[PDB]
């Protein structure tokens, strides 16, 4: 909500396709493309670089090689900031073989090095059936750790892929294998990007026309691998589910957390256009661009989707904002619009800005085909906006969006009576009280310290008693019931209490007088013109109103005693691990064993990890709430814990009536606390707590967390059963292969079991078995054997082949793991010289040995979340039917 | 029934209030000292409390249908519909619609000239005298047209250069026509003879990438028939290709971004715009293109006939037809032409304000029995056998006059609706009474509306300075009860809620109690924002569509739904748009159980059931095992290879489908003793 609509930059190079695409290099420069800026003989177009401090394009020098010809250079761009280098492209290279010519694409990478040129410049010599001839590669273009990439559409069958080029190392190349039947014409590679993450890097490829529909196929590099990922089909046929793609991070840890994509042609009722939020889940075979939502906008044939850059950190709110484009807008006018992130993989469909062609851009036709930002460039200090138009380009700034806490408060606490119920002989003494507010801002991480961040003029709007046209008081200064100033704010508090006159007489006396202020951001001049408009949040509460009681007549006497208690309970509340139990049902009661309280008021205390949210039940129940009141949530303590106060607004609570309500805190899944969590409820009377002992109520609850363990057995288990048994021998060793990953979303200690049977009646069963762990460091693992209840085992079997390990003395195997981290497909194998002796032991055939394998964790702190999932232990049965 | 109190201030804010909301006009209704707020519940109570029945206002929507004399229009009546719609309540107007016949014909043929339509142009180049003939019988002197088309002049859709662009005849060279993309070669004409003649003239061509351009060449035909000439009639055109289809994006690849215009502009029958020109997006036609009355037919090879099926979906009045690569079964495209062209009776609108929300209803001939949803997809009528549309308008608010249109989508018969708000309900004047309400106010069905200055129930009081004692005793719900709930101060018995100048925030009540801000929120908004729902006392009145304490669960909709169309396949509730997958079955559908072992188990005694005869053991098989299809085809999925029941390595791939213990499996005709 904070993209500049007056002072920006804008380059009008009228070059014919300039402007066209666009991408931000090393944050002092601006690139621009322009393909059809004709040069020499049907040949390239040309790039423009372009500065802040002057408001001018130069052109860029090139060493067009003659063999490159009709490539219209710039179409494609694309830059890295790792060390700074940028990507630009002719996509049409036409290198005559005599009797057709075809298409090869040539790219160049430019920056503070060498001018290099890498296809590599392997001039494209000369060769239904195709393989690489016209296969514009550089069309899309995005870097990554491991070396640039560049995308071929008609590669094959115009399958399509992307050529990774190393470190001088020669390059690779991945399409979709043959196998892979279908994907005829779908311009796989249309566009590209990355996808780093905590692990290896992970490549995107767009296909517009998979099946002329669609789709969207994301691939890994796996060492000696490089297979695919997963992928989404499209929704509708011509919707061209995979123009644009990109890579965004809700949050700023690093890890890219979900993914965009485009479809300018898509509809059902209303051709706006189409982008699909996609997340990244881990574990590949699954994955949905169905995260639920999909942002539009209410206006047909506009091509909303053509573009999108990730912008990042702009409002300080911690959630990376996204811009995204659609030129169709309007009567063809171009258009832009802003989204916010919210928790993980998710945006929020209402945006909270659209920056169209109406914004006196005076007259351009289509605006907003391609963009790219999140570099600072004017060097003022928060990140900038690039975005491409038919002729020119424009340059959007980002204005600093501080704000501000407040604190209200009245020196007098109450009121004495003294001047209450007044008289008439003499005077009005109109009783003097004191309001003191104060003015601090405090989340300031992006503007940093210094000028702007700390320098600001505000209007200050108090005004007591507003919504009645019965003024309470007025303040001195001015005598009116209102009263304004401007004074100067900074990060450190700014605390004036004002002088209140209260008449002597008075009617109303039990409804506390109300002052609040309305404040805002006032001239906006700040030294040098380098911050121009700051500006305010969504969320700002510029209406911060504080109440003034009164010492209510409890009547000619007997001294007003505020007794009041408060006790409150969770009914069923069972063990409470986060995952599970989102929503805490609190069921408060509370007392009156004193004078009545009015305003009676009831906060609680406890840790960040949830807050209250409105019940407003109906439907029905029971003997139970019924009741209106207005709760403020507000951090309090040093650091963690903080206060939501509830007072019951519209109504009185007498005598010693009871009273019994419920309220309501969601806690979030990953919630920060304890391995125990108390709370309290202080409760109190709209007259303040007059005296010493506080009234608190509260209690500690043991914490738990939910955990997603599961655990298969892999097919390559060994049932081999079979005729041949003359002797006893020893060695066809069987293998166990259990396999274990953990969906949950928290690093965790385990400790996985098994059960093995040997021992038979002293004829072991198999023997020297132990267990091998692949792929992972050698871990420590336990040994124990036991011995079963001793049943009849004669008749036992006789019911059911299996040889449980409730037979056999069977083999524990206890192995322990350090941390689990979650996704960690940690799997392993036991195998074992199995013997054939004790077959003879229990007079049967066709006989079948059981293995269970159980994981285990420490039931407390940690729990399985869906209510009971035994995935947590699987079991392989080998068979040993062996006759004659 | 179900009426929450708005701010009441006349019988017409009451009604603003909701659909169960009914008023009283009775006078010497309010007691002593009454709200006036009263007179305003729901029928039931009214008469509970005394309200005489024939005093309950309650101002209804209803439909004007006047019906024209006759050809005014032919088959879709009522003509004009004037209806006066009151905000929330629907007003449902019915449209006989009884097609009849067959009007004036005008084809087009649209074709593809590549060299894989070379024994197409052969055994088509002079088939229309049997046209004509198929024309002959249900419509009378129709027209015929054609129009050519190939690819992209310009790569990568074909080589631009050199002359192998003079010549692109792939070795044969038999001095094929020059690389084109829209070729007017003949206007709609009566005769048949000079069609066929002047279409074996011309040759075929060729291009580079495999789908064709055959869309660009769509808008082009129905752009600009100031060059072109159409019929005032009918038009029905053909698509015909062996080959792909390209749309918008994909010129991008030619060094164009210039987007599709929408009219054409040729200067001798042949486009030379295409090059400097992007492809019509997938959309473009079925609005351009149904707005000039046109209807392609898709007629192309089996390999591309189910890719043109899902085109049929998305727009309108169009059928799919499968031939062979010979074009020989052509004429029998147009026999299945008006089977499911004259079938597709469609009832949309113009795109109407959002301020306004339109459904239809639907009674098809065969059986049929829909209600609720836009359109009117009845494909089971044809010739002279009417049908029913039930058409529920409703509004928001109250609307500012307007009109709109309801068309039958590929018809000319346009039905001027108009629109009329009413919001109003009337009674008496200001000659009656000038008493009551001391002079400072006029009456209106019992109660006195005030001057900007007087308030009351009979404009007695002052809003400057007033109050009484027991005054203060219908101004408290009750004894133990603030007076006017604060946030509110009492005159002349009833309250004055105070104002808040802040988005949003207001009181209302008899005691100001009700507020529109303290509700359930969702998503950082109140009772989900002013898109999904309200706020209203506590209560959110979620808008149309939207269920839930604070219209939570967004959406009455189900995108729970696949392909399939049945809702989470296997297990799974839908609520709100999600599965509540059984198991470990996963999102969004739930169909992979990625942690299930993959029971082969107690399977392979039915495996040797059905396939093989070798004993249904525990009982007979049909009954022991539901999986109960066989089909005979490679399915795959879940590739299983175990055992029999003696001896014998039994293979057999097997693909579950939906719901719970449903399978579909493929047994090998093989075992290994
Ligand atoms: C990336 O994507 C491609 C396509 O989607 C995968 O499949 C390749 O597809 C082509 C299809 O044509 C395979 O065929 C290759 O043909 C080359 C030359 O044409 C021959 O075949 C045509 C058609 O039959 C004839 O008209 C013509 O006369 C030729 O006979 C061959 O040179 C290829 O090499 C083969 O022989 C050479 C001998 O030197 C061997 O070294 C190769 O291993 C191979 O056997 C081939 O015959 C081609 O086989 C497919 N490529 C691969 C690698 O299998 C690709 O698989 C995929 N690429 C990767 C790395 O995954
Ligand atoms: C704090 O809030 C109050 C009220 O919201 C401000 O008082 C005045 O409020 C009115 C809105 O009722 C402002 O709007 C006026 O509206 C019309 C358009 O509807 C516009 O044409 C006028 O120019 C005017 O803006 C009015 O601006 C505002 N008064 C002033 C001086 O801006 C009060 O101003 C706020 N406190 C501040 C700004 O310190
Ligand atoms: C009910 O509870 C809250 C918090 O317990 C009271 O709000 C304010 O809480 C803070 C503590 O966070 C009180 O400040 C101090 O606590 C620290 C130790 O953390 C201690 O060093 C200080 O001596 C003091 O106790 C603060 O006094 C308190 N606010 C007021 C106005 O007293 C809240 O006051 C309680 N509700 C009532 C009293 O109605
Ligand atoms: C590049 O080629 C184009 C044609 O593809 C040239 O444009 C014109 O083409 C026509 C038809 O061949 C010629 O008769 C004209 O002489 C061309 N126009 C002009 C002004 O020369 C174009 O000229 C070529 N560009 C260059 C500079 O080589
Ligand atoms: C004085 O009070 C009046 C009425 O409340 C108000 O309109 C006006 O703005 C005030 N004047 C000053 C100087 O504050
Ligand atoms: C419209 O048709 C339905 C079904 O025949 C009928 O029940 C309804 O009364 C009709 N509506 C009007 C307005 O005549
Ligand atoms: C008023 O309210 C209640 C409900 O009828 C009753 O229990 C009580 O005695 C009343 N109080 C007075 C002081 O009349
Ligand atoms: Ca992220
Ligand atoms: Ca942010
Ligand atoms: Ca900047
Ligand atoms: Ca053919």
């Known amino acids: 909500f904070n993209l500049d609509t007056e002072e920006l930059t804008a380059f009008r190079v009228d070059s014919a396709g300039f402007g066209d695409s666009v991408v931000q290099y090393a944050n002092s420069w601006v690139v621009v493309g322009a393909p059809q800026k004709i040069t020499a003989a049907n040949q390239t177009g040309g790039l423009y670089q372009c500065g802040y401090s002057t408001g001018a394009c130069e052109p860029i020098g090139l060493q067009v090689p003659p063999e490159a010809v009709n490539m219209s250079l710039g179409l494609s761009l694309a830059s890295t900031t790792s060390p700074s280098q940028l990507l630009a492209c002719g996509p049409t290279v036409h290198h005559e073989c005599g009797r057709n010519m075809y298409l090869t694409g040539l790219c160049f990478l430019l920056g503070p090095t060498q001018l290099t040129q890498r296809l590599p410049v392997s001039r494209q010599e000369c060769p239904s059936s195709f393989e690489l001839e016209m296969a514009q590669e550089g069309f899309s273009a995005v870097f990554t750790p491991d070396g640039p990439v560049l995308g071929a559409v008609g590669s094959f069958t115009w399958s399509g892929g992307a050529f990774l080029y190393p470190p001088n190392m020669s390059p690779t190349f991945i399409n979709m294998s043959q196998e892979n039947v279908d994907m005829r014409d779908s311009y796989l590679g249309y566009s590209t990007e990355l996808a780093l993450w905590k692990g290896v890097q992970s490549l995107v490829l767009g296909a517009p026309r998979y099946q002329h529909t669609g789709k969207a196929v994301i691939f890994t590099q796996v060492s000696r691998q490089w297979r695919m990922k997963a992928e989404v089909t499209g929704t509708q046929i011509g919707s061209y589910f995979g123009a644009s793609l990109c890579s965004v991070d809700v949050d700023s840890d690093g890890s890219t957390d979900l993914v965009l994509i485009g479809a300018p042609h898509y509809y059902e009722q209303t051709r706006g256009g189409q982008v699909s939020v996609c997340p990244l889940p881990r574990g590949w075979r699954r994955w949905w661009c169905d995260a639920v939502l999909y942002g539009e906008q209410g206006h047909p044939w506009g091509r909303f989707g053509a573009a999108l850059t990730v912008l990042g950190d702009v409002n300080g709110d911690k959630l990376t904002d996204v811009v995204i484009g659609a030129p169709g807008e309007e009567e063809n006018r171009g258009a832009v619009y802003l989204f916010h992130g919210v928790l993980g993989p998710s945006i929020s469909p209402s945006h909270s800005q659209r920056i169209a062609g109406s914004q006196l851009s005076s007259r351009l036709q289509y605006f907003g085909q391609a963009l790219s930002g999140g570099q600072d460039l004017t060097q003022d200090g928060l990140v900038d906006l690039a975005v491409g138009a038919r002729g020119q380009v424009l340059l959007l700034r980002t204005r600093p969006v501080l704000w501000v806490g407040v604190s209200m408060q009245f020196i007098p606490a109450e009121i004495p009576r003294s001047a209450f119920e007044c008289r008439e002989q003499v005077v009005s003494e109109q009783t003097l009280v004191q309001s003191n507010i104060c003015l601090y801002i405090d989340k300031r991480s992006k503007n940093l310290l210094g000028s702007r961040d700390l320098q600001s003029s505000v209007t200050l709007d108090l005004a ?333 079997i006789q019911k059911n082949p299996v040889l449980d390990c409730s037979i056999a003395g069977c083999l524990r195997f206890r192995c322990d793991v350090p941390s689990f981290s979650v996704q960690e497909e940690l799997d392993f194998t036991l195998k074992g010289n199995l013997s054939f002796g004790w077959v003879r032991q229990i007079l049967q055939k066709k006989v079948s040995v059981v293995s269970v394998a159980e994981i285990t964790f420490d039931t407390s702190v940690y729990s399985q979340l869906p209510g009971q999932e035994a995935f947590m232990r699987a079991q392989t049965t080998t068979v040993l039917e062996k006759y004659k | 029934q179900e009426c929450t109190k708005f701010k009441v201030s006349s019988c017409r804010e009451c009604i603003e209030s909701g659909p169960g909301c009914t008023w009283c006009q009775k006078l010497n209704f309010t007691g002593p000292g009454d709200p006036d707020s009263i007179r305003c519940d729901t029928r039931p109570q009214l008469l509970m409390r005394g309200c005489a029945a024939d005093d309950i206002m309650d101002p209804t929507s209803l439909a004007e249908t006047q019906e024209d004399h006759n050809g005014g229009q032919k088959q879709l009546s009522p003509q004009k519909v004037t209806l006066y719609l009151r905000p929330g309540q629907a007003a449902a107007f019915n449209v006989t619609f009884r097609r009849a016949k067959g009007y004036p014909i005008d084809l087009y043929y649209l074709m593809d000239l590549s060299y894989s339509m070379l024994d197409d142009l052969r055994n088509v180049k002079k088939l229309g005298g049997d046209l004509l003939r198929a024309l002959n019988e249900i419509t009378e002197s129709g027209r015929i047209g054609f129009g050519s088309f190939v690819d992209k002049t310009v790569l990568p859709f074909v080589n631009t250069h050199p002359d192998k662009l003079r010549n692109p005849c792939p070795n044969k060279e038999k001095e094929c026509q020059p690389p084109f993309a829209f070729r ?112 392609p037919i898709f007629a192309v090879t089996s390999r591309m006939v189910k890719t043109y099926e899902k085109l049929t979906e998305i727009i309108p009045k169009s059928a799919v037809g499968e031939l062979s690569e010979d074009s020989s079964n052509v004429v029998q495209l147009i026999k299945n032409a008006y089977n499911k062209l004259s079938s597709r009776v469609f009832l949309d609108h113009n795109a109407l304000p959002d301020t306004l929300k339109v459904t239809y209803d639907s009674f098809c001939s065969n059986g049929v029995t829909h209600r609720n949803q836009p359109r009117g997809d009845c494909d089971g009528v044809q010739i002279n056998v009417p049908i029913t549309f039930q058409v529920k308008v409703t509004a928001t608010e109250c609307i500012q006059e307007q009109s709109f249109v309801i068309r039958a989508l590929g018809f000319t018969d346009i039905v001027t609706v108009q629109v009329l708000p009413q919001c109003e309900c009337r009674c008496r004047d200001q000659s009656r009474d000038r008493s009551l309400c001391h002079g400072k106010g006029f009456l209106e069905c019992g109660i006195c509306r005030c001057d900007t200055g007087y308030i009351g129930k009979n404009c007695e009081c002052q809003t400057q300075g007033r109050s009484s004692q027991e005054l203060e005793g219908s101004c408290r719900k009750d004894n133990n009860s603030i007076i006017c709930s604060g946030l509110g101060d009492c005159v002349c018995g009833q309250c004055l809620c105070h104002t808040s100048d802040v988005p949003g925030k207001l009181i209302y009540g008899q005691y100001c109690e009700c507020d529109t801000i303290n509700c359930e929120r969702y998503n950082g908004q109140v009772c989900g924002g002013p898109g999904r729902g309200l706020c209203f006392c506590g209560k959110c009145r979620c808008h149309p569509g939207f269920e839930g304490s604070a219209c939570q669960c967004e959406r009455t909709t189900e995108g729970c739904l696949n392909p399939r169309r049945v809702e989470c396949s296997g297990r799974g509730r839908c609520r709100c748009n999600v599965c509540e997958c059984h198991s470990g079955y996963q999102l969004p559908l739930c169909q992979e159980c990625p942690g299930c072992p993959s029971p082969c188990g107690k399977y392979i005694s039915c495996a040797e059931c059905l396939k093989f005869e070798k004993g249904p053991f525990g009982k007979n098989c049909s009954a022991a095992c539901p999986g109960l299809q066989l089909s005979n085809n490679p399915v795959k999925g879940r590739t299983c290879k175990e055992r029999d029941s003696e001896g014998c390595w039994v293979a057999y791939t097997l693909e579950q489908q939906d719901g719970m213990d449903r399978y579909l499996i493929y047994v090998d005709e093989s075992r290994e003793c």
């Open chain 2, 184 to 295: 007017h070669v003949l206007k709609l004409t009566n005769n048949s003879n000079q069609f066929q003649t002047e279409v074996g003239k011309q040759l075929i061509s060729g291009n580079l990438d495999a789908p064709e351009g055959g869309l660009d060449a769509m808008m082009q035909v129905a752009a600009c028939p100031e060059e072109i000439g159409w019929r005032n009639v009918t038009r029905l055109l053909v698509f015909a290709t062996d080959d792909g289809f390209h749309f918008a994006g994909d010129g991008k690849l030619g060094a164009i971004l210039t987007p599709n215009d929408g009219r054409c502009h040729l200067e001798d029958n042949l486009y030379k715009r295409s090059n400097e020109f992007d492809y019509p997006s997938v959309g473009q036609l079925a609005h351009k293109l149904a707005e000039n009355n046109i209807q």
């Open chain 1, 464 to 796: 007591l008693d507003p919504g009645r046209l019965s003024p309470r008081a007025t303040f001195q200064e001015t005598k009116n019931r209102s009263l304004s100033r401007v004074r100067v704010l900074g990060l450190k508090a700014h605390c004036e209490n004002f002088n209140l006159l209260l008449p002597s007489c008075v009617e109303d006396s039990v409804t506390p007088i109300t002052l609040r202020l309305n404040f805002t951001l006032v001239g906006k001049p700040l030294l040098a013109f380098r911050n121009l408009r700051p500006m305010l949040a969504a969320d700002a509460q510029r209406y911060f109103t504080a109440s003034l009681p009164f010492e209510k007549n409890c009547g000619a006497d007997h001294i007003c005693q505020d007794n009041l208690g408060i006790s409150f309970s969770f009914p069923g509340l069972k063990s409470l691990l986060v995952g599970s139990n989102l929503e805490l049902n609190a069921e408060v009661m509370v007392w009156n064993d004193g004078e009545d309280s009015y305003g009676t008021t009831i906060t609680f205390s406890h840790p960040a990890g949830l807050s209250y949210r409105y019940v407003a039940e109906g439907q029905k129940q029971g003997q139970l709430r019924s009741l209106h009141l207005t709760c403020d949530s507000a951090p309090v303590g040093s650091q963690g814990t903080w206060s939501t106060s509830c007072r019951i607004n519209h109504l009185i609570f007498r005598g010693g009536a009871q009273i019994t309500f419920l309220a309501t805190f969601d806690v979030s899944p990953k919630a920060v606390l304890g391995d125990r969590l108390l709370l309290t409820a202080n409760v109190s009377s709209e007259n303040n707590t007059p005296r010493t002992s506080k009234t608190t109520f509260q209690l500690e609850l043991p914490v738990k967390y939910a955990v997603y363990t599961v655990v298969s057995s892999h097919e390559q288990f060994t049932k081999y059963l079979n005729f041949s048994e003359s002797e006893e021998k020893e060695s066809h060793v069987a293998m166990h292969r259990y396999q274990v990953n953990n969906l949950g979303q928290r690093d965790l200690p385990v400790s996985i079991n098994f059960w093995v049977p040997v021992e038979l009646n002293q004829e072991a069963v198999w023997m020297d078995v132990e267990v091998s762990h692949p792929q992972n460091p050698s871990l420590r693992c336990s040994s124990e054997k036991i011995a079963p209840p001793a049943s009849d085992f004669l008749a036992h």
